[PDB]
Amino acid sequence: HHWGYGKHNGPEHWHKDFPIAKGERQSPVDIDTHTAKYDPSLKPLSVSYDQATSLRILNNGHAFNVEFDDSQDKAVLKGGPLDGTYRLIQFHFHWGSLDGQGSEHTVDKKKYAAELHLVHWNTKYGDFGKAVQQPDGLAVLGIFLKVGSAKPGLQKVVDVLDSIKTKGKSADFTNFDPRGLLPESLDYWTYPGSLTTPPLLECVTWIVLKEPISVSSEQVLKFRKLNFNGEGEPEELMVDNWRPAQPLKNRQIKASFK
Ligand SMILES: CCCc1ccc(S(N)(=O)=O)cc1
Ligand SMILES: CCCc1ccc(S(N)(=O)=O)cc1
Ligand SMILES: [Zn+2]
Numbered sequence: 619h620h621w622g623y624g625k626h627n628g629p630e631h632w633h634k635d636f637p638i639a640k641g642e643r644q645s646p647v648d649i650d651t652h653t654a655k656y657d658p659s660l661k662p663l664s665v666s667y668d669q670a671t672s673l674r675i676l677n678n679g680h681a682f683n684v685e686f687d688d689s690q691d692k693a694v695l696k697g698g699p700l701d702g703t704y705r706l707i708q709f710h711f712h713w714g715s716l717d718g719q720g721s722e723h724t725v726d727k728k729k730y731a732a733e734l735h736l737v738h739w740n741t742k743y744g745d746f747g748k749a750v751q752q753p754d755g756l757a758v759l760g761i762f763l764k765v766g767s768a769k770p771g772l773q774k775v776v777d778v779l780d781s782i783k784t785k786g787k788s789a790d791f792t793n794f795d796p797r798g799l800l801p802e803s804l805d806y807w808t809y810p811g812s813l814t815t816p817p818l819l820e821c822v823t824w825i826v827l828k829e830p831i832s833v834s835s836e837q838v839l840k841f842r843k844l845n846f847n848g849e850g851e852p853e854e855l856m857v858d859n860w861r862p863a864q865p866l867k868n869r870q871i872k873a874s875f876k
Contacts, residue, residue, distance in 0.1 A: 645811030646722035679785035704738035768834035771798020
């Protein structure tokens with residue numbers, strides 16, 4: 619794998635090694651709020667993170683991931699459009715070089731400063747690897763970030779970034795509560811899509827919250843000081859690690875709210 623976000627290995631190149639990049643249910647997409655329809659068949663959404671067990675934070679050269687113990691039903695997502703139980707495995711963000719860009723999904727073409735992805739796999743498939751071979755294998759909860767007041771529940775993440783500056787670095791990140799990253803409202807849009815990075819697999823039920831969280835300029839500035847490169851290599855700032863909106867094709871976006 620040599621894909622990235624630069625001019626020479628970015629989203630316009632991915633299809634050459636991952637042909638599904640031009641598939642029928644790719645993500646992200648623009649959410650046209652006027653075209654999205656309230657769906658009364660959606661069940662209440664349940665985010666149950668009270669027993670979440672975070673483990674580690676890692677710079678993988680594309681973003682940073684906070685990883686969780688998913689060997690049991692400790693932190694799960696249920697309800698909404700979902701059939702069954704989806705276990706939290708990791709979260710990460712995508713962000714921009716400037717406040718006016720960074721999100722992957724857009725809302726009426728509006729780009730947010732960043733986007734948080736909480737990644738879950740369908741427990742009926744036994745493990746994450748098997749889940750990504752299924753059309754309903756994954757559920758990703760997406761949350762927009764705008765720049766304004768600081769998000770206190772994000773600060774522990776911001777503070778540890780100095781220790782994972784470069785690709786391949788990791789640090790202990792136990793006892794982190796991901797509930798501190800959510801907005802007040804769970805109103806959402808949902809549609810069937812894909813991973814937004816290679817391998818771009820079409821396994822994801824996307825649940826994108828309507829209400830953004832606010833983070834401070836200082837918090838997002840710290841994200842932008844991370845490096846795509848490994849230690850000892852020329853420095854490339856980890857910024858603009860987002861894929862732009864892809865064709866909606868034969869899909870409808872549903873809203874949980876009237
Ligand atoms: C020297 C690496 C060149 C290169 C390899 C792979 C990709 S892709 N199709 O985005 O995975 C783009 C550029
Ligand atoms: C091995 C796949 C890892 C992975 C890639 C992309 C995503 S995302 N940006 O949430 O669609 C989640 C997990
Ligand atoms: Zn993501």
